[PDB]
Curated annotation (Swiss-Prot):
Pathway: Cell wall biogenesis; peptidoglycan biosynthesis
Cofactor: Mg(2+)
EC number: 6.3.2.13
Reaction(s) the record says it catalyses: UDP-N-acetyl-alpha-D-muramoyl-L-alanyl-D-glutamate + meso-2,6-diaminopimelate + ATP = UDP-N-acetyl-alpha-D-muramoyl-L-alanyl-gamma-D-glutamyl-meso-2,6-diaminopimelate + ADP + phosphate + H(+)
Highest rank taxon of the organism: Bacteria
Protein name: UDP-N-acetylmuramoyl-L-alanyl-D-glutamate--2,6-diaminopimelate ligase
Molecular functions (GO terms): ATP binding; magnesium ion binding; UDP-N-acetylmuramoylalanyl-D-glutamate-2,6-diaminopimelate ligase activity
Modified residues (N6-carboxylysine): K217
Lineage: Bacteria, Pseudomonadati, Pseudomonadota, Gammaproteobacteria, Enterobacterales
Gene expressing this chain: murE
Pfam families cross-referenced by the UniProt entry: Mur_ligase, Mur_ligase_C, Mur_ligase_M
pH note: Optimum pH is about 8.
Signal peptide coordinates: none
Subcellular locations according to the entry: Cytoplasm
Length: 487
């Protein structure tokens, strides 16, 4: 790594300097490093130039605004200071070059939108790896090779992706946050494909506002290497964009494919939501088939179809995708289904808010021939407002509400339960059982073979905080033990 080579595309005849790491933070800027001084929302990195020089950085790249012209080479205490205009916009490209263009050395798929980003990202990584890739994820959960995700500037993005390349990753599914995109944090990444789970957003009822939102985004996307566009046609904005993008792949499970366009497409023709997942019949420009998904609810059908369409667009054979689809797993504690022969279906989900609980019950309902049970509580020593709302939701969208404990902490467990029950029309119809394990056992042991029991609130979070103790407890383990299966 050399300053001269680093800057060659932009600043010819830049000094020759060996560079260790690239950093925006003058605090950690050690000897031999390249310090990058950026002008930010409320901070100006150029302030910390003398400090960085004092810690022995090899060279500095600094925002040119007001202080210099673009590509201006200066020299302070023997250290090169190269000024570049619009450094924020160029930082991704700069870092990309520094870290040997990691997105050109694996298949990078970017997923954007509000809902289903995490799941779709995870399914992309899972499915690609089942097809022979060494897959990785980058996003809100964390970064890492599949099953070793460790819990973010344009430099960090490039740096982490290079780290994954070094660990042998050949495929990376990246969640792209709306904010990350706008702030040019993925500006120079070569995306093999970009998946749009949706492009809708609240607060856009004024026609001028929707117009500006779309223009802003369209402009942004025009400036990125998006690769193959895979768009959810069940989204209103998605459809309008698909109408303008003849090379984009349209995906639908609600009959929004327009075949007159002769574009590439994938649609679910029918779905059977059964006790252990969904059987998805689909047609596509690549051929038709049938997938046995072990994921629950309509949203996860959409998410799966988006991943399928993406991988098909990237040229993975339909037959191989079909042969591996049954091995796709739910994201841990996200509508994770547990079945056993002749037992009720039990779903463990992390849902701990009124909206999450409602969605999880609506999803569970689809797979439920009999009665839908909901076992849940609310956290103690936290905001109490959601309690009656979650009570009301459990009453409305389930057949049997089993109200129990969930991390009561120092608060009186029964008081929390009372707040939950307060929101119900017929609290008397609810079952109350304290001891969460006992409540789960009650639902599971009493529920019929064709019932579904949703156990909500914890998902993967395997502890019960009672008083000051994080006592060892797991919904997944409790459920697995009751059903005679392995969590
Ligand atoms: O830019 S982003 O939208 C996509 C990449 N992510 C993951 C990331 C990289 C380094 C630290 O965290 C940040 C948000
Ligand atoms: O589809 S996009 O995400 C990326 C490409 N851009 C510009 C464009 C349209 C047709 C040719 O170039 C639109 C947004």
């Amino acid at each position: 790594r050399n300053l001269r080579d680093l800057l060659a595309p932009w600043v010819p005849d830049a000094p020759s300097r060996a560079l260790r790491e690239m950093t925006l933070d003058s605090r950690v800027a050690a000897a031999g490093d390249l310090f990058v001084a950026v002008v930010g929302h409320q901070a100006d990195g150029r302030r910390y130039i003398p400090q960085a020089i004092a810690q022995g950085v090899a060279a500095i790249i600094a925002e040119a605004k007001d202080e210099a012209t673009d590509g201006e080479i200066r020299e302070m205490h023997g250290v090169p200071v190269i000024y570049l205009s619009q450094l924020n916009e160029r930082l991704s490209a700069l870092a990309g070059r520094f870290y040997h263009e990691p997105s050109d050395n694996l298949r990078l798929v970017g997923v954007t939108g509000t809902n289903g980003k995490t799941t779709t990202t995870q399914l992309l990584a899972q499915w690609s790896q089942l097809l022979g890739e060494i897959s990785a994820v980058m996003g809100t959960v964390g970064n890492g090779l599949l099953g070793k995700v460790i819990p973010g500037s344009a430099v960090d993005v490039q740096h982490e992706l290079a780290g994954l390349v070094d660990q042998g990753a050949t495929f990376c599914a990246m969640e792209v946050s709306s904010h990350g995109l706008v702030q040019h944090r993925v500006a120079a990444l070569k995306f093999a494909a970009s998946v749009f789970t949706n492009l809708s957003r609240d607060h856009l009822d004024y026609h001028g506002d929707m117009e500006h939102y779309e223009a802003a985004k369209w402009l942004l996307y025009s400036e990125h290497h998006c690769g193959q566009a895979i768009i959810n046609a069940d989204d209103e904005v998605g459809r309008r964009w698909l109408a303008k993008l003849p090379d984009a792949v349209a995906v639908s499970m609600e009959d929004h494919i327009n075949p007159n366009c002769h574009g590439r497409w994938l649609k679910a023709t029918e779905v059977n939501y059964h006790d252990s997942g969904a059987t998805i019949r689909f047609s596509s420009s690549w051929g038709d088939g049938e997938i046995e998904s072990h994921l629950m609810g309509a949203f996860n059908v959409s998410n799966l179809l988006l991943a399928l369409a993406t991988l098909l667009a990237l040229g993975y054979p339909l037959a191989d995708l079909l042969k591996t689809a049954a091995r796709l797993q739910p994201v841990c504690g996200r509508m994770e289904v547990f079945t056993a022969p002749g037992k009720p279906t039990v779903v463990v989900d992390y849902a701990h808010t009124p909206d999450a609980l409602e969605k999880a019950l609506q999803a569970a309902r689809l797979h439920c021939a009999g009665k839908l049970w909901c076992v849940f509580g609310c956290g103690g020593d936290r905001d109490k407002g959601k309690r009656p709302l979650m009570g009301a939701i459990a009453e409305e969208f389930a057949d049997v509400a089993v109200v129990t404990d969930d991390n009561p902490r120092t608060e009186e467990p029964r008081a929390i339960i009372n707040d939950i029950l307060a929101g119900m029309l017929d609290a008397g119809h609810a079952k109350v059982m304290e001891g969460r394990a006992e409540a789960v056992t009650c639902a599971v042991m009493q529920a019929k073979e064709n019932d579904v029991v949703l156990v909500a609130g914890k998902g993967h979070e395997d502890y019960q905080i009672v008083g000051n103790q994080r006592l060892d407890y797991s919904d997944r383990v409790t459920v697995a033990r009751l059903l005679g299966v392995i969590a």
